[PDB]
Structures are given as structure tokens and as C-alpha cells.
Design an enzyme around this catalytic site. Structure first.
Site, PDB file in Angstrom:
ATOM      1  CD  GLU B 357      97.233  14.616 -14.299  1.00 20.87           C
ATOM      2  OE1 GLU B 357      98.109  15.444 -13.968  1.00 20.87           O
ATOM      3  OE2 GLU B 357      96.910  13.646 -13.582  1.00 20.87           O
ATOM      4  CD1 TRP B 459      97.444  -5.705   8.801  1.00 19.46           C
ATOM      5  CD2 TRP B 459      97.332  -3.512   9.229  1.00 19.46           C
ATOM      6  NE1 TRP B 459      97.333  -5.049   7.600  1.00 19.46           N
ATOM      7  CE2 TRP B 459      97.261  -3.700   7.835  1.00 19.46           C
ATOM      8  CE3 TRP B 459      97.280  -2.211   9.737  1.00 19.46           C
ATOM      9  CZ2 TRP B 459      97.140  -2.638   6.944  1.00 19.46           C
ATOM     10  CZ3 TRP B 459      97.159  -1.157   8.851  1.00 19.46           C
ATOM     11  CH2 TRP B 459      97.091  -1.377   7.469  1.00 19.46           C
ATOM     12  CG  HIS B 487     100.385   6.980  -0.487  1.00 17.64           C
ATOM     13  ND1 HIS B 487      99.901   5.973  -1.295  1.00 17.64           N
ATOM     14  CD2 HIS B 487     100.092   8.141  -1.117  1.00 17.64           C
ATOM     15  CE1 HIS B 487      99.337   6.503  -2.366  1.00 17.64           C
ATOM     16  NE2 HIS B 487      99.441   7.817  -2.283  1.00 17.64           N
TER      17      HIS B 487
END
Lengths: 97, 597
Positions: B357, B459, B487
Site C-alpha cells: 500500500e 470456454w 473485473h
């Protein structure tokens, strides 16, 4: 701790654009709209016409490096007029005999 | 009189106005994330719409300055992002419906839940509820009930919303003179204007495919190692030459294999390195965790943190009265205002997270001298990669013995290091094939090579070839796997995870060669070495103002991605996996299915 307040202070402005560079010890308060190109402006904002004065964002939350600093510049010039302002003096004790 | 003078004048004034509104827009989101109130939810939408509509109004004057008359490289890059009109190129009907689909798919993902089949009354949401149970669940049926029933009410429900998501985003790329929407995300790596360093957008397709070929021999040995441990549990469903089930990957989508590190431990008779019990006796709080991590940036020559950074940090969550998101995130507002919102407990992971961070904040300090348009990473992968190389040096036993966390008498040998390299491999090695799989699938569907009926047909067919994962229950075209992903549904870049692994290992090898470290790469520590911080600081301040291919050469000497640091750092683990897999079959077959015998 003084100028910056919550919400921003728009009272202090600055001149972002000018057609040339200012001469030493010159103050220009003109609010005339800066013309970047050859397009006529006539005080109306638009293409190639920009309002020169911009605002300083002032809040306590900004980083230390960008915090506003109050700058006091003393101009020392020696002219042919009689000198008046001088440094402080010092008085000693008085002895007799 | 020249266009360059008119373009530079527009950019000089725009950098001031865009920087003032972006700070207030990020500040409104900061007060909303740290405190949930009725005033902050309105300020975030108000300040967010003022900044969003500001780029739309300035885009009208940006398209009036052609880049053909500008001979400056820095000017054309600042006008490159402003030249795009965003959603303004779409029709009024498609522009308003675009934000509706994005808000609907994000709401269903947040409000989605799977009720317990055994307890119909209790219904648990996915995050945290279902994501936490799937981590520690060893049951075959309990994991299948949460994995299969989710896409029934989500994947099947988001299918008509995903079909509209593909059509709307394709019309935007066609108006922008892009081949497809898959090429839009590849435009972030685009480099033009410099002789010899030009990088085509279509080159990324061949780059991710070629680098993945050398990943196969490293991934096949690890995939066979994980399969050998779970083979004794279910020998019927798990074939030695077959593939592993999808629900047993340790979580819902199989992004990280770290959840399986418990059962895959090669040697359980030796202790493991943990700083959790060490920080308890030392009695450390959230104040000194960031303080000890700040000294790590000073030893490499990087500047320290400003007084406003440590004072405005949010170290905990004051109960339910004022609620803050505990998901670690580094928020960059502007004008030197740096803040991080994270819930800091005492754990071994929070120690490495503090270096990550603070790595983003330390990364933003170098290029902070650039204009607002030039403040950004050179690409989407460099953002998180800079924070990871800071945590990799902290996880080494050398850095832990320096500050006193690990005892100096701790024995360090092959048995201890192989156990450490396996934990990182589950997060790293397992991510690359999964990230290459889903991103390549999106590029093929957005291009139009796969009809709507073959979405799920291709897939799972290409899934056994890449990651070697087969479905327990066959699915039809109604289900959509990427629709439930965080996402894809939230329209975030999924390619940044694949390239991040290659960029972080290149920087790890270059910095250790500059400080003259000897031995294996996982023994390297960049602390106390000021020579490596100077070579890295030159690139960190460039940002995207310079081509990422040019900035990459100034550090590692390479003009593109390379697998050599990926193999060398994993070389001690690759030699141990090859010897243990001799009794098993290296590789898998795509013709095996659990329901087909």
C-alpha cells in the site's frame, strides 16, 4: 494554518497567461482576456480565448510542499537622497571621574 | 501563430482546471468510503459528475488541435487522451443505456446470494459470505452447491445484460477507428512517434501467446504436483492424466491457489516463517507498522513520507457507527495529498500489505512533478508491480532478521525455502494461465470469431488446454462465467494481472544485480542498498510521459517482456518439482471428463 480553510479560498488569484514576460519591478493588474491565437476575443470566452486569472486551492488537507507560503520581499535600493533608515544602535553605561 | 503554441496554451490552462476538480472529486469519494452518510453519498455523485462532464466539455476543444502539425512528443501524448470523446461518440440512446447496464450488472453482483440448500431460510451473499466458506471447505458437495447454483441465478441472468454490453462497447471502438473493443484495452501499450521503439497494438496478442509457451513446462510440473496431493481423496473423479475439478481450486473462479497451500506442504515436520506471533510479544500497533515500512524506503534512497500522510491515515474501523471499507486501497487525490484506507490488524499478511500500500504512494511521489495529464503509470501493469517488489524483499528471511521479527538462530536451508517458494507459486504461477485464458477469450468474443452459441463451448474447451480445468456439471450457452467475475462486470482491466508478473520479476533481477547480490534470487534483499534505488528512481518519475518500452530499457535493458526472470526466480522450485513428478505423469489431456467415461 491561516489562509487555507475548509472548502477552498478563491480570493487569491494569479496571472497564468501573458503575451510576454514582465519587466523587473512591474505590476500589471489588467484583467483583459489573453488571446492565444489570431482568433478575435473581445472579452468573450471561447476558442483560443482564455481568462488569465486562476484560483489557488487552499485547504489544510493538501501536502506540505504545496502549502501556501506568505512571502515578504524587502527591496533595498540606495538612491542619491539623504539616508534615513539605519540599523538599531546600542547604549552602554555612563561612568564619571 | 503555430498550432503547437495554441495546443500548449490549451494544455497549460487545462492542467490547472482538471487538477482542481479531480481533487474535489477524489476527496468526496474519500469521505464517502471512510464514513457512510447521506451527505457523502450526494457529494460523491455531485463532485463525480462535475469532473466527468468537465472532460466531455474540454474534449470539444481538444479535437480542434490536430496532432499532425505538432512536432513535440510530450504535447501529442497529453492530447492523446483528450482527443477521445469517450461515450460522446455513441448515440444518445446507446449512451444512456450504457451506464444502466454497468450499474445493473454491478448491483446484481453485490446483491447476489446463494441460499443454503439444506437451510432455505439462511441465504448468504457471495462477498464475504460465500467467498469465505469456499476457502476452507473441504467437502465435495458443499463446494459444488455454492459454485453451481451461483451462475444459475447470476450467470444465466446476466447473459442478456452481457450481450448488450458487447454491442454497446463495440460501437464506441468503431467510431474511434479501432478494430474492435478488444483492441481498445490493447491501446494502453500503444507506442508511436519514436523511431525503433514503436509498439503495435496487435503485437500484444503474439506477445502473451509466445511468453505463455515457456510458462507451460513450469506450470505442468506444478499442476501435476497439486493433482497428486488431491488424487487420494477422490481417485475416481480425479484422473492422473485428467484435469482438476473447477470447484476445488480453492475459491469460486480459481484465481489464486493459495487456499490449497495447507494440504500441499511438502514437509510438515519443519516450522514455517510467521511474524504474527513475533509482533504480539513486541506489542506493536498500527502506528509503528507504517513507521517501520517507511524506513525501508529511506534505506534505498527514496524520500520519506510527508507529515500529512501519516496523520491522515485511517488505521482501523471505529465499529459500526462509522463504517469504512477494509479492502486495502491506495487513494491518490492530488497536490501532494496521499491517503490510504485500510483496516490494520496484527497478521503476517498485513505486514507485507503495508509495503504494497505504501508502494503506490512512494510510486506517486516520483512523477508528482509532472503535469496532471502526465501523472499516471506508463501502463496498467506498472501500478501494482511497483508495490509487489517492495513486499517480495520484505518476505525474505534476511529482511525479517534485520528488524528483529525472525530469530537470528532460525535455520535457513532448502527445506525451508522450497516451502516458501511453493506458497508464492500458487498465487503467481497459477494466475498466469488463468489470466491468459479469460483475457484471450474476451478478445475473441469481442472480435466476432465466436458466435453467441459457442461462448460456453469454447470456454471450457480452451480451459482444459490452458489451465487444465474441467467442469463437473456441463453447462449450456445460458451460463456466462465472466459475467459474474468482479473485473469483467465492473469494466476493469483484466490484462494488467498477466503482464504484472513479468514486469515485477524483471525489476527484481535488475535491482539485485545493481547492488551486487550473490546467490539465488529469492535470497536477495534490497534494503540498506542505495545503488538500486537510484537506477529505479529515474524510471519512476517518467510515468507515461515517455514510452514504456523506452523506460523499461533504462532499468532491465530489455525492450519487451521476457520469461528469463520468471524461470530463474522459480528455478529452485522447478528442480524439486521435476524429481517429485517422476512417479506421476507430467501434463494433462483435454479428452477427459468427469461425466464422460
Amino acid at each position: 494554518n491561516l489562509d487555507s480553510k475548509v472548502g477552498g479560498n478563491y480570493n487569491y488569484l494569479y496571472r497564468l497567461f501573458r503575451k510576454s514576460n514582465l519587466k523587473p519591478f512591474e505590476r500589471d493588474i489588467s484583467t483583459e482576456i489573453y488571446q492565444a491565437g489570431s482568433t478575435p476575443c473581445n472579452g468573450v470566452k471561447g476558442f483560443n480565448c482564455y481568462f488569465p486569472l486562476q484560483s489557488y486551492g487552499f485547504q489544510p488537507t493538501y501536502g506540505v510542499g504545496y502549502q501556501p507560503y506568505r512571502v515578504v520581499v524587502l527591496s533595498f535600493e540606495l538612491l542619491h537622497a539623504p539616508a534615513t533608515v539605519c540599523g538599531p544602535k546600542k547604549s552602554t553605561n555612563l561612568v564619571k571621574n | 501563430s503555430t498550432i503547437e503554441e495554441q495546443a500548449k496554451t490549451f494544455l497549460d490552462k487545462f492542467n490547472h482546471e482538471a487538477e482542481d476538480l479531480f481533487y474535489q472529486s477524489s476527496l468526496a469519494s474519500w469521505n464517502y468510503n471512510t464514513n457512510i452518510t447521506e451527505e457523502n453519498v450526494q457529494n460523491m455523485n455531485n463532485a463525480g459528475d462535475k469532473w466527468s462532464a468537465f472532460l466531455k466539455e474540454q474534449s470539444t476543444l481538444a479535437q480542434m488541435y490536430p496532432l499532425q502539425e505538432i512536432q513535440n512528443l510530450t504535447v501529442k501524448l497529453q492530447l492523446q487522451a483528450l482527443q477521445q470523446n469517450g461515450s460522446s461518440v455513441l448515440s444518445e440512446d446507446k449512451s444512456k443505456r450504457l451506464n444502466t447496464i454497468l450499474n445493473t450488472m454491478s448491483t446484481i453482483y453485490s446483491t447476489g446470494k446463494v441460499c443454503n440448500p439444506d437451510n432455505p431460510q439462511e441465504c448468504l451473499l457471495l462477498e464475504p459470505g460465500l467467498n469465505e466458506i469456499m476457502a476452507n471447505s473441504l467437502d465435495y458437495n458443499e463446494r459444488l452447491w455454492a459454485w453451481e447454483s451461483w451462475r444459475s441465478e447470476v450467470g444465466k441472468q446476466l447473459r442478456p445484460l452481457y450481450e448488450e454490453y458487447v454491442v454497446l462497447k463495440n460501437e464506441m471502438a468503431r467510431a474511434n477507428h479501432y478494430e474492435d473493443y478488444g483492441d481498445y484495452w490493447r491501446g494502453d501499450y500503444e507506442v508511436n512517434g519514436v523511431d525503433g521503439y514503436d509498439y503495435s497494438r496487435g503485437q500484444l496478442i503474439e506477445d502473451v501467446e509466445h511468453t505463455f509457451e515457456e510458462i507451460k513446462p513450469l506450470y505442468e510440473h506444478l499442476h501435476a504436483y497439486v493433482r497428486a496431493k488431491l488424487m487420494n481423496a477422490y481417485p475416481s473423479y480425479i484422473s492422473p492424466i485428467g484435469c482438476l475439478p473447477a470447484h476445488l481450486l480453492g475459491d469460486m473462479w480459481g484465481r489464486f491457489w493459495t487456499n490449497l497451500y495447507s494440504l500441499t506442504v511438502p514437509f510438515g515436520q519443519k516450522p514455517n516463517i510467521d511474524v504474527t506471533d513475533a509482533m504480539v510479544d513486541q506489542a506493536w500497533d498500527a502506528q509503528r507498522i507504517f513507521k517501520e515500512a517507511e524506513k525501508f524506503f529511506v534505506s534505498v534512497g527514496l524520500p520519506n513520507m510527508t507529515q500529512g500522510f501519516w496523520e491522515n491515515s485511517m488505521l482501523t474501523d471505529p465499529g459500526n457507527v462509522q463504517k469504512a471499507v477494509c479492502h486495502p486501497t491506495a487513494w491518490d487525490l492530488g497536490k501532494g495529498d496521499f491517503r490510504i484506507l485500510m483496516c490494520t490488524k496484527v497478521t503476517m499478511d498485513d505486514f507485507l500489505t503495508a509495503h504494497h500500500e505504501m508502494g503506490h504512494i512512494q510510486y506517486d511521489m516520483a512523477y508528482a512533478a509532472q503535469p496532471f495529464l502526465l501523472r499516471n503509470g506508463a501502463n496498467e501493469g506498472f501500478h501494482e508491480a511497483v508495490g509487489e517488489i517492495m513486499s517480495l524483499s520484505a518476505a525474505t528471511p534476511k529482511h525479517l532478521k534485520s528488524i528483529g521479527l525472525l530469530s537470528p538462530d532460525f535455520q535457513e536451508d532448502n527445506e525451508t525455502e522450497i516451502n516458501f517458494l511453493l506458497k508464492q507459486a500458487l498465487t503467481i504461477v497459477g494466475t498466469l494461465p488463468f489470466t491468459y485464458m479469460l483475457e484471450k477469450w474476451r478478445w475473441m468474443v469481442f472480435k466476432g470469431e465466436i458466435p453467441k452459441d459457442q461462448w460456453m463451448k469454447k470456454w471450457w474447451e480452451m480451459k482444459r488446454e490452458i489451465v487444465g480445468v474441467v467442469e463437473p456439471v456441463p453447462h449450456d450457452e445460458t451460463y456466462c462465467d465472466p459475467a459474474s467475475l468482479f473485473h469483467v462486470s465492473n469494466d476493469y482491466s483484466f490484462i494488467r494481472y498477466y503482464t504484472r508478473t513479468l514486469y515485477q520479476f524483471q525489476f527484481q533481477e535488475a535491482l539485485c544485480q545493481a547492488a551486487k547480490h550473490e546467490g539465488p534470487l529469492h535470497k536477495c534483499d534490497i534494503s540498506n542498498s542505495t545503488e538500486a534505488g537510484q537506477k529505479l528512481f529515474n524510471m519512476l518519475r517518467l510515468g507515461k510521459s515517455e514510452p514504456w518500452t523506452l523506460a523499461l530499457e533504462n532499468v532491465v535493458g530489455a525492450k519487451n517482456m521476457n520469461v528469463r526472470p520468471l524461470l530463474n526466480y522459480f528455478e529452485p522450485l522447478f528442480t524439486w518439482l521435476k524429481d517429485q513428478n517422476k512417479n506421476s505423469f507430467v501434463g494433462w489431456s483435454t479428452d477427459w471428463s468427469p461425466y464422460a467415461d
